[PDB]
C-alpha cells in the first residue's frame, strides 16, 4: 500500500556520525590526460636532468673507486 515516498530525516546526523570526511589532498596528481605536448616535453626535461646528474655520479664514483 501507500508508503513514505522520501525523507532526508536523520541523514545529516548519519553523515556527521563518521564526520564529513575531507579529500586526502595528495602532493602529486596524475598527469595522464593533462596538457600533452607539455607533459611530454617535461618527460624530456626530466630525462635530460637525470642523465646529466647520473653521468657526473658515475664519473665521481669511478674516479673515487678506481
Amino acid at each position: 500500500a501507500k508508503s513514505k515516498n522520501h525523507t532526508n530525516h536523520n541523514q545529516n546526523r548519519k553523515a556527521h556520525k563518521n564526520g564529513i570526511k575531507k579529500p586526502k589532498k595528495h602532493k602529486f596528481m596524475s598527469r595522464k590526460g593533462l596538457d600533452p605536448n607539455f607533459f611530454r616535453n617535461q618527460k624530456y626535461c626530466l630525462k635530460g636532468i637525470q642523465k646529466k646528474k647520473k653521468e657526473l655520479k658515475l664519473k665521481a664514483k669511478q674516479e673515487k673507486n678506481n
Binding site: Q11, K14, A15, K17, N18, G19, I20, K21, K22, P23
Partner: peptide
C-alpha cells in the same frame, strides 16, 4: 569540493 552525504570529494 562538493559535499556528497557523508564526505566531501574533489
Amino acid at each position: 569540493n562538493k559535499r556528497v552525504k557523508h564526505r566531501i570529494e574533489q
